[PDB]
Design a protein around this ligand. Structure first.
Ligand code: SF4
Ligand code: SF4
Ligand code: FES
Ligand SMILES: [K+]
Ligand SMILES: [Zn+2]
Lengths: 696, 112, 89, 124, 115, 64
């Protein structure tokens, strides 16, 4: 199907139907473009990519012209040079002289391509003046300066096709055509802020980031996002000690150039409510203390209560790094304790998926195989709010194929068509035995996705029993090459905590009345027991409900201030990279446990990060293989699924409620973010308010 | 290759026993469609966990003690970067660049 | 079930085995058949199975006070692996 | 009250005192930026112990001066053109849309322009 | 153009045995000028401590095996010898050279900030 | 290229030692790297050929 074409005397070979601009990139030839993006639908409204076909008297747009065999393409003839200068002059005819006051200045594609391909002088001296366009209000996240738009429709194409928000379009005709929503309303989409990156000009810019920096000042660090369990790769920009903005970076296997509005706009919470100094409680007030005094008080408080084997309880939050989890586990183990768990509210003391088999709690199919899915079953999950990027990937496959998505549980506003079945296990039993289960059996690459909120309901055991029986009894779900069982988590620490076995499988242990509670970033502890006489130590980076419930507070560093290990929902090990230092006298989270261990008579054998990381290999061999998913073998996977099949367990018929209540408030950083406060007031908890009540 | 050229370079011993360098290829910026910066391999050093940046109280200046904070080496090939890092006896690690999967794109797909 | 009832001192069992290769087949076969029996005798004992390409088979048993003892299982038959687990008691 | 001297506000709730050295500016009490350090806090430093605060540089606040300028009302035109009222010695010439029923300031000078048909609405 | 005092012509030695003799010859020259180093720079230590310092610096490269590294090390040692004997260094540099000075535990570094 | 532009050490006068001494480098304002603002687009093309005609490998005459 390959066609051997020519681009400026260079042999190229690509799939049939590929655009010329795609073949030119493969040949190393650069063609200017404004309206073309490799992730959006084809448009030809900008005319900047014009090339000359060898035998044809017309100039073809390389982004839309299909490739042919024997086609010879010229891209640098004087005729094309005339076209590039002419199109550049038209673009800059009505463009406002705003570069000094425009946030796109040092990273403007219009500036760079006009410099590279346009003329050095303009000829617009008209006394009538340029076009003036009023600024549209579309919420507190996207700042609009519509004079600078070049009518390239990247925002329209993205919000309609990728984001699935059809309230944004082009209204008007000719020179009076204006991008926007026509009526006075906001853009309601968890992925709306990606429109800022796609806009090549300053027409759409970040409102929190407005005026605060220039791109040449910023330092770029390639790290991962920890606001969800996808582990989306991001590029954190810093200016000295402060993080300025968060941008996505390309990874076709995880996030594919997109991030949610929560990921890129919660960075302003790193400057608010931070834990910078050790705190010691004296009655009803917290007072500052030194690290030596704080650690000594914990040791003194440890001997005051004299906790026994299972009276020492350790809780790990959603943003807790893996090095600290193992260090806390080993310190807990050295004290003869096994009462370790996460701050979740799972009904069964051992989670229904368990921790013995990795395949029982990971995305075994991996995110990149959603492109090949034919049937998808959603069991009590809301991908739009739990995994915003992964939700958009399902829509992309849904649009370009006959993929059918069935949903069991609480209905939600979706970006694609959901074949809803019910809101309990009873419907799931009917579906897997009815026509819905026949589609999965006949599907070549079926997908089954269980939400993280299933284990937080009273029917957690029934849901995993129904799927496991169906998965084991059908030979197409589990094959040597394909694995259709997936679990979609919403916290970046769950899979890392389960890989190291940081969970109690003994119901008797978890019911112990603890006397020494070590909160490692745990904040969802309203429904988790904390005795009034128990000694509580909180270790984290933000002051929240966890800090208020503590007696001694140990300040830690955030994910941007430490090289930390996080395992995402598909079992991919990723390591963060430190961009700045922690504020005040905050330390690395795994060093606080190590230092406190010497004060408790349980000195850990860890001294440096390499020794700590070598301990990760001892706990699990796959924890030192970054960016690599280690799959579970076919034979072992079947045993784990069979272990989930539990006969003689009743189904209570309760609602499979979605776990997330407020999309913008899911962790300490997001809650502390002033931008998320504006989002809740304007967009709402479920991003359902179409009118902005805080914008005048 | 095997020669320990750090014994004659004159650089301090802290570059070997205390600092970690990253060999990487720069990722494409999400705000621009250019790919020129992604054609070269670069080496930089991880920040110091303390003293990388602190605020000078007199004028608010960004004070630092890391002398390698502003040094970024440029290489044309990955092998050249590895050979130089090995020659200087540096503790390093390689970040493999992410490659974009190729998908056919045509105007006809807007309706089919 | 025989000696598969591990004592109190044994608190965590970790099986390291490769997805591919020939050395991990005896341990994979042992884990495939015996795990329902091993879990039956010890309902609340965490028995973590972790895999990685190319690693030799081994069993890590976390004893009391966080003390762990590792035993390589390369080249052993299925029965010898069962004997090995019993000796950790 | 030290709350008006250390918090950014759109307007000062009282009349500025030109002789008061704890104000952010001689013509403005409160700071005009969220990241602007209050003058009272800045002067509470060891380097001001034996220094006369009156002779320190205290330029007038530009935010209070710009809003003393009356709104320019444009007749029979929905577009305003501003280049700094100096030409070659001003700022780059920009065009301001006046369709909305409010005054819209210049991106450089801060002078506010509006249509005459909206004069009654804006003033009230 | 005449070379300065105590100037040697740079040469690349291709024999390991010959290189050993050159280092030994240069080692004795340092010891013989130890009293001159004390007198010229007005040090606070006797010449015996200088010879101990010279021996310690030479012993740091005793187990260097690569011949190309030896030539660079020997060449720089000759340059250092010429610098000291000709009184080109200022007295402050030599004083700081001899002003070179159990590590802290994990907690001691942790409490202060470490590196 | 691996040598930092600011070096490794700096000098000052030590009152206790009554002399100038070398100390490890610490900058009150760290050097700001504005070179990361380089253009993401190539600026100069492949250029024009100025090889003399007497120094180009000849092209053989075509088929009969
Ligand atoms: S979008 Fe680009 S060309 Fe237009 S004002 Fe901003 S920086 Fe200048
Ligand atoms: S607003 Fe930006 S992204 Fe949308 S059409 Fe205009 S230039 Fe393109
Ligand atoms: S890039 Fe082809 S016309 Fe816009
Ligand atoms: K933009
Ligand atoms: Zn103006």
């Amino acid at each position: 199907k390959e066609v051997e074409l020519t681009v400026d005397g260079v042999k190229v070979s690509i799939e049939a139907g590929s655009s010329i601009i795609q073949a030119a990139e493969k040949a190393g030839v650069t063609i200017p473009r404004y309206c073309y993006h490799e992730k959006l639908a084809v448009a030809g409204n900008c005319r900047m990519c014009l090339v000359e076909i060898e035998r044809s008297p017309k100039l073809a747009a390389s982004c839309a012209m299909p490739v042919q065999n024997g086609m010879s393409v010229l891209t640098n003839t004087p005729k094309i040079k005339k076209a590039r200068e002419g199109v550049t002059e038209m673009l800059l005819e009505n463009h406002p002289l705003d570069c000094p006051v425009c946030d796109q200045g040092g990273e403007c594609d219009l500036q760079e391509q006009s410099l590279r391909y346009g003329s050095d002088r303009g000829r617009f001296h008209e006394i009538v003046g340029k076009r003036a366009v009023e600024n549209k209000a579309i919420g507190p996240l996207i700042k609009t300066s519509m004079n600078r738009c070049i009518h390239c429709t990247r925002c329209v194409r993205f919000l309609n096709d990728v984001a699935g928000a059809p309230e944004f379009g082009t209204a008007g005709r000719g020179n009076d055509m204006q991008i926007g929503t026509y009526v006075e309303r906001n853009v309601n989409s968890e992925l709306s802020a990606n429109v800022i990156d796609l806009c090549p000009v300053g027409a759409l810019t970040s409102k929190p980031y407005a005026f605060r920096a220039r791109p040449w000042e910023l330092k770029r660090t390639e790290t991962i996002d920890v606001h969800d369990a996808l582990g989306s790769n991001v590029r954190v920009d810093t200016r000295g000690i402060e993080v300025m903005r968060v941008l996505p970076r390309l990874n076709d296997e995880i996030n594919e150039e997109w991030i949610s509005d929560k990921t890129r706009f919660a960075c302003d919470g790193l400057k608010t409510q931070r834990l910078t100094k050790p705190l010691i409680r004296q009655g009803n007030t917290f007072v500052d203390a030194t690290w030596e005094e704080a650690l000594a008080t914990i040791a003194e408080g440890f001997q005051k209560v004299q906790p026994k084997e299972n009276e020492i309880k350790a809780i790990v939050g959603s943003l807790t790094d893996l090095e600290s989890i193992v260090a806390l586990k080993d310190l807990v183990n050295k004290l003869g304790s096994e009462n370790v768990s996460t701050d979740g509210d799972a009904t069964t003391v051992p989670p229904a998926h368990g921790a013995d088999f990795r395949s029982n709690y990971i995305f075994n199919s991996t995110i990149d195989n959603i492109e090949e899915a034919d049937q998808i079953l959603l069991v009590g999950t809301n991908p739009r709010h739990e995994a915003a990027v992964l939700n958009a990937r399902i829509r992309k496959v849904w649009l370009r194929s006959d993929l059918e998505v069935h949903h069991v549980g609480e209905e939600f506003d979706s970006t694609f068509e959901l074949n809803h079945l019910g809101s309990d296990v009873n419907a799931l039993a009917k579906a897997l035995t009815g026509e819905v289960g026949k589609k999965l059996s006949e599907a070549s690459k079926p997908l089954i996705i269980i939400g993280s909120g299933v284990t937080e309901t009273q029917d957690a055991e029934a849901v995993y029993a129904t799927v496991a029986k169906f998965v084991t009894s059908n030979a197409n779900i589990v094959t040597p090459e394909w694995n259709g069982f997936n679990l979609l988590h919403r916290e970046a620490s769950r899979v890392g905590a389960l890989d190291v076995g940081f969970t109690t499988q003994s119901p008797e242990v978890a019911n112990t009345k603890a006397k020494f509670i070590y909160l490692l970033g745990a904040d969802e502890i309203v429904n988790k027991d904390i005795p009034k006489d128990a000694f509580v130590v909180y270790q984290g980076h933000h002051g929240d409900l966890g800090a208020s419930f503590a007696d001694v507070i140990l300040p830690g560093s955030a994910y941007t201030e430490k090289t930390a290990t996080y395992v995402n929902t598909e079992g991919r090990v990723q390591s963060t990279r430190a961009a700045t230092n922690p504020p005040g006298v905050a330390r690395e989270d795994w060093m606080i446990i190590r230092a406190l261990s010497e004060y408790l008579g349980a000195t850990l054998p860890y001294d440096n990060l390499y020794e700590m990381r070598s301990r990760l290999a001892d706990v699990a061999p796959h924890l030192l293989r970054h960016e690599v998913v280690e799959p579970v073998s076919e034979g072992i996977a079947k045993v784990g699924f069979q272990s989930l099949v539990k006969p003689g367990i009743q189904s209570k018929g309760v609602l499979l409620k979605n776990p997330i209540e407020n999309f913008y408030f899911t962790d300490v950083i997001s809650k502390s973010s002033p931008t998320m406060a504006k989002c809740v007031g304007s967009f709402g908890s479920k991003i359902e308010k179409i009118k902005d009540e805080k914008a005048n | 290759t095997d020669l320990a050229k750090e014994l004659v370079s004159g650089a301090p011993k802290e570059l070997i026993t205390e600092r970690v360098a990253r060999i990487y290829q720069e990722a494409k910026a999400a705000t621009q469609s250019g790919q020129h910066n992604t054609e070269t391999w670069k080496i930089d050093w991880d920040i110091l966990n303390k003293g990388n940046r602190w605020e000078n109280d007199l004028m608010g200046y960004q004070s630092s003690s890391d002398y390698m904070q502003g040094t970024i080496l440029k290489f044309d090939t990955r092998e050249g970067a590895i050979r130089f890092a090995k020659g200087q006896g540096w503790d390093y690690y390689i970040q493999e660049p992410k490659v974009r999967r190729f998908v056919k794109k045509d105007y006809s797909a807007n309706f089919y | 079930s025989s000696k598969f009832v591990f004592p109190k001192v044994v608190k965590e069992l970790r099986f390291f085995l490769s997805q591919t290769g020939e050395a991990s087949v005896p341990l994979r076969s042992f884990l495939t058949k015996t795990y329902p029996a091993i879990k039956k005798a010890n309902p609340t004992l965490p028995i973590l199975i972790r895999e990685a390409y190319g690693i030799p088979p081994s069993v890590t048993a976390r004893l009391e006070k966080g003390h762990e003892v590792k035993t390589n299982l390369e080249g052993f038959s299925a029965d010898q692996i069962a004997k090995t687990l019993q000796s950790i008691a | 009250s030290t709350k008006e001297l250390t918090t950014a506000r759109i307007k000062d709730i009282s009349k500025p005192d030109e002789n008061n050295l704890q104000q952010q500016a001689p013509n403005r009490i409160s700071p005009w930026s969220k990241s602007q350090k209050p003058r009272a806090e800045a002067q509470d430093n060891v380097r001001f112990a034996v220094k006369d605060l009156a002779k320190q540089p205290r330029p007038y606040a530009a935010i209070d001066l710009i809003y003393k300028q009356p709104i320019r009302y444009i007749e029979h035109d929905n577009v305003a053109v501003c280049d700094g009222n100096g030409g070659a010695q001003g700022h780059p010439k920009v065009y301001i849309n006046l369709d909305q029923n409010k005054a819209i300031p210049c991106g450089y000078c801060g002078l506010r322009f509006a249509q005459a048909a909206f004069k009654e609405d804006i003033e009230s | 153009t005449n070379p300065t005092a105590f100037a040697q012509t740079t040469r690349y030695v291709k024999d390991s045995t010959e290189m050993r003799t050159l280092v030994l010859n240069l080692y004795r020259r340092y010891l013989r000028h130890s009293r001159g180093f004390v007198n010229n720079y007005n040090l606070d230590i006797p010449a015996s401590q200088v010879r101990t310092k010279i021996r310690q610096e030479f012993e740091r490269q005793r187990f260097v095996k690569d011949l190309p590294l030896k030539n660079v090390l020997y060449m720089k040692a000759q340059m250092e010898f010429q610098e000291l004997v000709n009184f080109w260094k200022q007295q402050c540099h030599v004083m700081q050279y001899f002003e070179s000075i159990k590590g802290d535990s994990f907690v001691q570094k942790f409490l202060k900030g470490a590196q | 290229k691996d040598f930092p532009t600011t070096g490794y050490t700096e000098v000052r006068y030590d009152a206790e030692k009554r002399r100038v001494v070398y100390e490890p480098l610490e900058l009150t304002q760290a050097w700001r790297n504005f070179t990361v603002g380089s253009s993401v687009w190539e600026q100069v093309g492949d250029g024009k050929d100025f090889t003399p005609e007497s120094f180009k490998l000849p092209t053989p005459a075509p088929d009969p």
